[PDB]
Amino acid sequence: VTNQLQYLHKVVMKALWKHQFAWPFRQPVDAVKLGLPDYHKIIKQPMDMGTIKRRLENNYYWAASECMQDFNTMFTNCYIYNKPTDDIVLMAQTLEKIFLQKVASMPQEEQE
């Protein structure tokens, strides 16, 4: 438990989890359900806000930057795999802007 991780849980995750574009991101991409047999050939580290939220709730992370990298991986996976014109990309872009806006006000020094 640190100040920055607390910020990431109470402010960042909170804002993103409840967002109207969040639903595709709340649980891992299900390649069988979506009919996407190449998903795991292209994305090697899948990530989603369910996993991140669980990690925050279970004090999995040692540094804020580790949680931040998971958010970033989640978004990057989306941009890499999907077509440029897919709606999911716009949804990801919207959530990521909120992520960055919030991260701009995160406590600067990690103190346990």
Ligand X SMILES: CC(=O)N1c2ccccc2CC[C@@H]1C
Annotated binding residues for a protein, written as ranges, equal: 38, 81-83, 86-87
Q: Which helix (H) or strand (E) holds 40?
A: helix 39-42
Question: Which residue in the set 29, 47, 56, 68 belongs to the binding site for ligand X (CB under 6 A)?
Answer: 29
Nearest-CB residue to ligand X? 24
d(CA 83, CA 101): 25
Angle at 110 between CA 109 and CA 112, to 5 degrees: 140
Name the residue among 12, 32, 33 with its Cα closest to residue 75.
12
| Smallest separation (angstroms) from a copy of itself to the CB of 81 | 7
DSSP tag of 2: -
Among ligand X, a copy of itself, none, residue 103 binds (CB under 5-8 Å by kind): a copy of itself
Three-state SS string across 8-21, please?
HHHHHHHHHHCCCC
User: What is the per-residue binding string for ligand X in 48-87, x denoting contact by CB under 6 A?
Assistant: ------------------------------x--xx-----
What residues line the site for a copy of itself (CB under 8 A)? 4, 42, 63-65, 68-69, 72, 75-76, 79-81, 84, 89, 93, 96-97, 100-101, 103-110
